[PDB]
mmCIF file of all heavy atoms in Angstrom:
data_model
loop_
_atom_site.group_PDB
_atom_site.id
_atom_site.type_symbol
_atom_site.label_atom_id
_atom_site.label_comp_id
_atom_site.label_asym_id
_atom_site.label_seq_id
_atom_site.Cartn_x
_atom_site.Cartn_y
_atom_site.Cartn_z
ATOM 1 N N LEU C 282 49.720 86.195 -64.506
ATOM 2 C CA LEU C 282 48.990 86.675 -65.715
ATOM 3 C C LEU C 282 48.918 88.181 -65.748
ATOM 4 O O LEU C 282 49.100 88.820 -66.829
ATOM 5 C CB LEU C 282 47.593 86.058 -65.778
ATOM 6 C CG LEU C 282 47.457 84.670 -66.431
ATOM 7 C CD1 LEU C 282 48.316 83.644 -65.629
ATOM 8 C CD2 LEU C 282 46.037 84.262 -66.457
ATOM 9 N N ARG C 283 48.656 88.800 -64.613
ATOM 10 C CA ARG C 283 48.594 90.296 -64.578
ATOM 11 C C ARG C 283 49.952 90.870 -64.920
ATOM 12 O O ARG C 283 50.015 91.839 -65.652
ATOM 13 C CB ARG C 283 48.174 90.720 -63.154
ATOM 14 C CG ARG C 283 48.090 92.227 -62.980
ATOM 15 C CD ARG C 283 47.460 92.577 -61.677
ATOM 16 N NE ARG C 283 48.145 92.080 -60.543
ATOM 17 C CZ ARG C 283 47.863 90.933 -59.948
ATOM 18 N NH1 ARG C 283 46.903 90.194 -60.371
ATOM 19 N NH2 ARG C 283 48.580 90.494 -58.878
ATOM 20 N N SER C 284 51.040 90.296 -64.349
ATOM 21 C CA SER C 284 52.364 90.687 -64.886
ATOM 22 C C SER C 284 52.544 90.458 -66.336
ATOM 23 O O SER C 284 53.124 91.233 -67.030
ATOM 24 C CB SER C 284 53.418 89.986 -63.999
ATOM 25 O OG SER C 284 53.339 88.574 -64.170
ATOM 26 N N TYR C 285 52.072 89.286 -66.777
ATOM 27 C CA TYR C 285 52.166 88.966 -68.191
ATOM 28 C C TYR C 285 51.308 89.964 -69.017
ATOM 29 O O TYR C 285 51.808 90.465 -70.072
ATOM 30 C CB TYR C 285 51.669 87.516 -68.498
ATOM 31 C CG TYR C 285 51.950 86.953 -69.830
ATOM 32 C CD1 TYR C 285 53.061 86.166 -70.031
ATOM 33 C CD2 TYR C 285 51.091 87.326 -70.941
ATOM 34 C CE1 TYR C 285 53.355 85.692 -71.302
ATOM 35 C CE2 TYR C 285 51.440 86.799 -72.181
ATOM 36 C CZ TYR C 285 52.510 85.996 -72.403
ATOM 37 O OH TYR C 285 52.800 85.481 -73.641
ATOM 38 N N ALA C 286 50.117 90.300 -68.554
ATOM 39 C CA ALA C 286 49.395 91.310 -69.230
ATOM 40 C C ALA C 286 50.080 92.654 -69.284
ATOM 41 O O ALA C 286 50.051 93.367 -70.266
ATOM 42 C CB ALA C 286 47.963 91.485 -68.498
ATOM 43 N N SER C 287 50.691 93.083 -68.081
ATOM 44 C CA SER C 287 51.492 94.291 -68.117
ATOM 45 C C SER C 287 52.622 94.117 -69.148
ATOM 46 O O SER C 287 52.913 95.167 -69.819
ATOM 47 C CB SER C 287 52.026 94.506 -66.725
ATOM 48 O OG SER C 287 50.972 94.676 -65.775
ATOM 49 N N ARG C 288 53.267 93.019 -69.212
ATOM 50 C CA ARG C 288 54.292 92.793 -70.223
ATOM 51 C C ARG C 288 53.710 92.877 -71.682
ATOM 52 O O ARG C 288 54.357 93.440 -72.562
ATOM 53 C CB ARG C 288 54.903 91.434 -70.048
ATOM 54 C CG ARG C 288 55.625 91.259 -68.701
ATOM 55 C CD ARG C 288 55.663 89.784 -68.296
ATOM 56 N NE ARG C 288 56.216 88.951 -69.320
ATOM 57 C CZ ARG C 288 56.361 87.635 -69.251
ATOM 58 N NH1 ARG C 288 55.878 86.923 -68.242
ATOM 59 N NH2 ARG C 288 56.878 86.929 -70.263
ATOM 60 N N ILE C 289 52.461 92.484 -71.873
ATOM 61 C CA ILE C 289 51.769 92.576 -73.161
ATOM 62 C C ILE C 289 51.623 94.055 -73.420
ATOM 63 O O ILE C 289 50.916 94.797 -72.694
ATOM 64 C CB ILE C 289 50.464 91.830 -73.163
ATOM 65 C CG1 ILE C 289 50.688 90.352 -72.815
ATOM 66 C CG2 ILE C 289 49.748 91.985 -74.455
ATOM 67 C CD1 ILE C 289 51.551 89.621 -73.862
ATOM 68 N N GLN C 290 52.135 94.487 -74.583
ATOM 69 C CA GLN C 290 52.000 95.903 -74.934
ATOM 70 C C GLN C 290 50.556 96.295 -75.256
ATOM 71 O O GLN C 290 49.884 95.542 -75.900
ATOM 72 C CB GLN C 290 52.903 96.206 -76.199
ATOM 73 C CG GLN C 290 52.468 95.383 -77.433
ATOM 74 C CD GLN C 290 51.391 96.037 -78.256
ATOM 75 O OE1 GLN C 290 51.047 97.201 -77.980
ATOM 76 N NE2 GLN C 290 50.949 95.399 -79.270
ATOM 77 N N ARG C 291 50.170 97.434 -74.754
ATOM 78 C CA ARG C 291 48.823 97.970 -75.033
ATOM 79 C C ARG C 291 48.874 99.488 -74.823
ATOM 80 O O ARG C 291 49.500 99.979 -73.871
ATOM 81 C CB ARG C 291 47.790 97.365 -74.030
ATOM 82 C CG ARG C 291 46.328 97.877 -74.276
ATOM 83 C CD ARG C 291 45.334 97.314 -73.300
ATOM 84 N NE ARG C 291 45.194 95.902 -73.476
ATOM 85 C CZ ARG C 291 44.405 95.159 -72.760
ATOM 86 N NH1 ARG C 291 43.597 95.634 -71.744
ATOM 87 N NH2 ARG C 291 44.323 93.844 -72.945
ATOM 88 N N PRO C 292 48.246 100.247 -75.743
ATOM 89 C CA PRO C 292 48.310 101.723 -75.645
ATOM 90 C C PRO C 292 47.536 102.265 -74.441
ATOM 91 O O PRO C 292 47.435 103.465 -74.324
ATOM 92 C CB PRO C 292 47.677 102.128 -77.020
ATOM 93 C CG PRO C 292 47.804 100.962 -77.926
ATOM 94 C CD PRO C 292 47.631 99.799 -77.009
ATOM 95 N N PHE C 293 46.879 101.362 -73.647
ATOM 96 C CA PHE C 293 46.019 101.772 -72.611
ATOM 97 C C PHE C 293 45.773 100.609 -71.629
ATOM 98 O O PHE C 293 46.484 99.598 -71.817
ATOM 99 C CB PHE C 293 44.707 102.360 -73.069
ATOM 100 C CG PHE C 293 43.996 101.491 -74.082
ATOM 101 C CD1 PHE C 293 43.140 100.471 -73.621
ATOM 102 C CD2 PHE C 293 44.167 101.673 -75.484
ATOM 103 C CE1 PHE C 293 42.524 99.643 -74.530
ATOM 104 C CE2 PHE C 293 43.572 100.826 -76.367
ATOM 105 C CZ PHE C 293 42.671 99.821 -75.900
ATOM 106 N N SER C 294 44.928 100.809 -70.672
ATOM 107 C CA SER C 294 44.560 99.661 -69.755
ATOM 108 C C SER C 294 43.029 99.543 -69.780
ATOM 109 O O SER C 294 42.311 100.220 -70.582
ATOM 110 C CB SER C 294 45.101 99.939 -68.394
ATOM 111 O OG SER C 294 44.665 98.900 -67.499
ATOM 112 N N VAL C 295 42.518 98.705 -68.941
ATOM 113 C CA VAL C 295 41.100 98.430 -68.866
ATOM 114 C C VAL C 295 40.640 98.248 -67.419
ATOM 115 O O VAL C 295 41.365 97.701 -66.590
ATOM 116 C CB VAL C 295 40.670 97.209 -69.673
ATOM 117 C CG1 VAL C 295 41.404 96.019 -69.259
ATOM 118 C CG2 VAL C 295 39.139 97.027 -69.688
ATOM 119 N N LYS C 296 39.417 98.696 -67.064
ATOM 120 C CA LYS C 296 38.921 98.550 -65.742
ATOM 121 C C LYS C 296 37.432 98.179 -65.852
ATOM 122 O O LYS C 296 36.781 98.507 -66.829
ATOM 123 C CB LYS C 296 39.042 99.828 -64.898
ATOM 124 C CG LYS C 296 38.434 99.781 -63.537
ATOM 125 C CD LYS C 296 38.966 98.623 -62.672
ATOM 126 C CE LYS C 296 38.203 98.457 -61.410
ATOM 127 N NZ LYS C 296 38.405 99.693 -60.514
ATOM 128 N N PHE C 297 36.996 97.467 -64.820
ATOM 129 C CA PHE C 297 35.526 97.025 -64.766
ATOM 130 C C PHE C 297 34.874 97.717 -63.581
ATOM 131 O O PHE C 297 35.430 97.840 -62.456
ATOM 132 C CB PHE C 297 35.475 95.500 -64.613
ATOM 133 C CG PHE C 297 34.096 95.027 -64.286
ATOM 134 C CD1 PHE C 297 33.148 94.827 -65.209
ATOM 135 C CD2 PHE C 297 33.790 94.697 -62.897
ATOM 136 C CE1 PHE C 297 31.925 94.368 -64.946
ATOM 137 C CE2 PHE C 297 32.524 94.278 -62.627
ATOM 138 C CZ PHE C 297 31.604 94.069 -63.622
ATOM 139 N N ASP C 298 33.661 98.147 -63.722
ATOM 140 C CA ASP C 298 32.841 98.784 -62.711
ATOM 141 C C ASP C 298 31.638 97.889 -62.334
ATOM 142 O O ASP C 298 30.677 97.816 -63.087
ATOM 143 C CB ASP C 298 32.331 100.163 -63.136
ATOM 144 C CG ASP C 298 31.579 100.887 -62.074
ATOM 145 O OD1 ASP C 298 31.518 100.365 -60.974
ATOM 146 O OD2 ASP C 298 31.087 102.008 -62.334
ATOM 147 N N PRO C 299 31.735 97.104 -61.263
ATOM 148 C CA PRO C 299 30.522 96.304 -60.884
ATOM 149 C C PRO C 299 29.299 97.109 -60.596
ATOM 150 O O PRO C 299 28.167 96.554 -60.752
ATOM 151 C CB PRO C 299 31.037 95.537 -59.636
ATOM 152 C CG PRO C 299 32.127 96.424 -59.057
ATOM 153 C CD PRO C 299 32.791 97.057 -60.239
ATOM 154 N N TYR C 300 29.394 98.358 -60.152
ATOM 155 C CA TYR C 300 28.244 99.114 -59.819
ATOM 156 C C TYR C 300 27.372 99.308 -61.090
ATOM 157 O O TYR C 300 26.075 99.469 -60.984
ATOM 158 C CB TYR C 300 28.667 100.490 -59.297
ATOM 159 C CG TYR C 300 29.239 100.349 -57.902
ATOM 160 C CD1 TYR C 300 30.125 101.355 -57.504
ATOM 161 C CD2 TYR C 300 28.922 99.338 -57.070
ATOM 162 C CE1 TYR C 300 30.691 101.307 -56.213
ATOM 163 C CE2 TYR C 300 29.507 99.322 -55.755
ATOM 164 C CZ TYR C 300 30.395 100.226 -55.346
ATOM 165 O OH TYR C 300 30.927 100.208 -54.125
ATOM 166 N N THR C 301 27.945 99.316 -62.309
ATOM 167 C CA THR C 301 27.175 99.481 -63.504
ATOM 168 C C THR C 301 27.499 98.379 -64.552
ATOM 169 O O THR C 301 26.968 98.422 -65.647
ATOM 170 C CB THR C 301 27.455 100.845 -64.165
ATOM 171 O OG1 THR C 301 26.720 101.009 -65.333
ATOM 172 C CG2 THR C 301 28.911 100.975 -64.439
ATOM 173 N N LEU C 302 28.374 97.425 -64.155
ATOM 174 C CA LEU C 302 28.723 96.377 -65.121
ATOM 175 C C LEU C 302 29.249 96.927 -66.383
ATOM 176 O O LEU C 302 28.910 96.445 -67.496
ATOM 177 C CB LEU C 302 27.525 95.391 -65.349
ATOM 178 C CG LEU C 302 27.038 94.563 -64.159
ATOM 179 C CD1 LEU C 302 26.381 95.454 -63.143
ATOM 180 C CD2 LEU C 302 26.081 93.514 -64.604
ATOM 181 N N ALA C 303 29.999 97.940 -66.308
ATOM 182 C CA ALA C 303 30.601 98.681 -67.458
ATOM 183 C C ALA C 303 32.105 98.561 -67.489
ATOM 184 O O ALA C 303 32.751 98.272 -66.399
ATOM 185 C CB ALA C 303 30.125 100.117 -67.458
ATOM 186 N N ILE C 304 32.699 98.763 -68.608
ATOM 187 C CA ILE C 304 34.172 98.681 -68.857
ATOM 188 C C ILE C 304 34.610 100.046 -69.335
ATOM 189 O O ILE C 304 34.071 100.604 -70.298
ATOM 190 C CB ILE C 304 34.560 97.585 -69.780
ATOM 191 C CG1 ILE C 304 34.158 96.204 -69.254
ATOM 192 C CG2 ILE C 304 36.015 97.648 -70.089
ATOM 193 C CD1 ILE C 304 34.808 95.895 -67.949
ATOM 194 N N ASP C 305 35.607 100.551 -68.646
ATOM 195 C CA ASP C 305 36.197 101.975 -69.009
ATOM 196 C C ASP C 305 37.641 101.783 -69.366
ATOM 197 O O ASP C 305 38.370 101.090 -68.683
ATOM 198 C CB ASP C 305 35.987 102.878 -67.846
ATOM 199 C CG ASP C 305 36.586 102.303 -66.517
ATOM 200 O OD1 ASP C 305 37.020 101.155 -66.500
ATOM 201 O OD2 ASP C 305 36.631 103.100 -65.522
ATOM 202 N N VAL C 306 37.958 102.441 -70.518
ATOM 203 C CA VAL C 306 39.336 102.367 -70.933
ATOM 204 C C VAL C 306 40.248 103.091 -69.903
ATOM 205 O O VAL C 306 39.804 104.075 -69.239
ATOM 206 C CB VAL C 306 39.552 102.935 -72.349
ATOM 207 C CG1 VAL C 306 39.066 104.482 -72.380
ATOM 208 C CG2 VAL C 306 40.971 102.807 -72.882
ATOM 209 N N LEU C 307 41.503 102.705 -69.862
ATOM 210 C CA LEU C 307 42.525 103.341 -68.955
ATOM 211 C C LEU C 307 43.625 103.818 -69.764
ATOM 212 O O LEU C 307 44.667 103.056 -70.047
ATOM 213 C CB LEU C 307 42.923 102.288 -67.911
ATOM 214 C CG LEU C 307 41.855 101.618 -67.035
ATOM 215 C CD1 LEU C 307 42.420 100.662 -66.062
ATOM 216 C CD2 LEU C 307 40.941 102.697 -66.447
ATOM 217 N N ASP C 308 43.564 105.103 -70.285
ATOM 218 C CA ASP C 308 44.581 105.665 -71.122
ATOM 219 C C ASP C 308 45.057 106.973 -70.613
ATOM 220 O O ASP C 308 46.075 107.473 -71.092
ATOM 221 C CB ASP C 308 44.121 105.799 -72.488
ATOM 222 C CG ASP C 308 42.794 106.629 -72.635
ATOM 223 O OD1 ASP C 308 42.304 107.051 -71.580
ATOM 224 O OD2 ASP C 308 42.301 106.868 -73.737
ATOM 225 N N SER C 309 44.361 107.655 -69.713
ATOM 226 C CA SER C 309 44.758 108.970 -69.220
ATOM 227 C C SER C 309 44.766 108.947 -67.711
ATOM 228 O O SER C 309 43.990 108.208 -67.035
ATOM 229 C CB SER C 309 43.789 110.042 -69.715
ATOM 230 O OG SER C 309 44.141 111.326 -69.183
ATOM 231 N N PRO C 310 45.561 109.833 -67.031
ATOM 232 C CA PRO C 310 45.597 109.911 -65.539
ATOM 233 C C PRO C 310 44.230 110.316 -65.031
ATOM 234 O O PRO C 310 43.866 109.888 -63.898
ATOM 235 C CB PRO C 310 46.618 110.984 -65.292
ATOM 236 C CG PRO C 310 47.501 110.975 -66.520
ATOM 237 C CD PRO C 310 46.607 110.677 -67.622
ATOM 238 N N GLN C 311 43.423 111.105 -65.718
ATOM 239 C CA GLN C 311 42.134 111.551 -65.230
ATOM 240 C C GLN C 311 41.211 110.330 -64.975
ATOM 241 O O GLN C 311 40.516 110.336 -63.923
ATOM 242 C CB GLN C 311 41.464 112.473 -66.178
ATOM 243 C CG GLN C 311 42.189 113.866 -66.344
ATOM 244 C CD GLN C 311 43.568 113.742 -66.981
ATOM 245 O OE1 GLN C 311 43.888 112.717 -67.482
ATOM 246 N NE2 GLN C 311 44.299 114.881 -67.021
ATOM 247 N N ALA C 312 41.163 109.390 -65.913
ATOM 248 C CA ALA C 312 40.348 108.234 -65.734
ATOM 249 C C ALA C 312 40.898 107.367 -64.488
ATOM 250 O O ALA C 312 40.091 106.875 -63.735
ATOM 251 C CB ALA C 312 40.432 107.356 -66.913
ATOM 252 N N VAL C 313 42.193 107.340 -64.313
ATOM 253 C CA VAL C 313 42.758 106.648 -63.163
ATOM 254 C C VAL C 313 42.389 107.340 -61.899
ATOM 255 O O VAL C 313 41.964 106.692 -60.898
ATOM 256 C CB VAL C 313 44.351 106.559 -63.299
ATOM 257 C CG1 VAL C 313 44.907 105.810 -62.122
ATOM 258 C CG2 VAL C 313 44.799 105.939 -64.592
ATOM 259 N N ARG C 314 42.441 108.646 -61.897
ATOM 260 C CA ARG C 314 41.969 109.394 -60.658
ATOM 261 C C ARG C 314 40.487 109.091 -60.337
ATOM 262 O O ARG C 314 40.106 108.949 -59.209
ATOM 263 C CB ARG C 314 42.266 110.871 -60.824
ATOM 264 C CG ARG C 314 41.967 111.752 -59.633
ATOM 265 C CD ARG C 314 42.005 113.164 -59.921
ATOM 266 N NE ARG C 314 40.873 113.595 -60.776
ATOM 267 C CZ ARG C 314 40.634 114.854 -61.136
ATOM 268 N NH1 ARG C 314 41.327 115.885 -60.583
ATOM 269 N NH2 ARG C 314 39.617 115.088 -61.919
ATOM 270 N N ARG C 315 39.696 109.087 -61.439
ATOM 271 C CA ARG C 315 38.272 108.793 -61.251
ATOM 272 C C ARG C 315 38.065 107.523 -60.421
ATOM 273 O O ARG C 315 37.276 107.506 -59.393
ATOM 274 C CB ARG C 315 37.554 108.697 -62.593
ATOM 275 C CG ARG C 315 37.525 109.968 -63.387
ATOM 276 C CD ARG C 315 36.611 111.011 -62.673
ATOM 277 N NE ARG C 315 35.280 110.512 -62.548
ATOM 278 C CZ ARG C 315 34.298 110.584 -63.515
ATOM 279 N NH1 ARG C 315 34.568 111.172 -64.664
ATOM 280 N NH2 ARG C 315 33.101 110.106 -63.250
ATOM 281 N N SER C 316 38.700 106.434 -60.839
ATOM 282 C CA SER C 316 38.599 105.196 -60.073
ATOM 283 C C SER C 316 39.266 105.346 -58.698
ATOM 284 O O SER C 316 38.738 104.793 -57.705
ATOM 285 C CB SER C 316 39.206 104.012 -60.850
ATOM 286 O OG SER C 316 40.586 104.289 -61.067
#
Side-chain angles (χ1 to χ4, degrees):
Chain C
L282 276 60
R283 180 171 57 267
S284 61
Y285 193 98
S287 302
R288 300 153 54 183
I289 300 299
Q290 61 87 7
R291 180 182 295 181
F293 51 86
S294 178
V295 60
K296 176 56 185 300
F297 169 83
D298 183 4
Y300 291 152
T301 182
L302 294 67
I304 297 300
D305 53 354
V306 62
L307 306 181
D308 58 357
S309 179
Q311 293 69 6
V313 182
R314 186 190 65 172
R315 294 291 303 273
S316 61

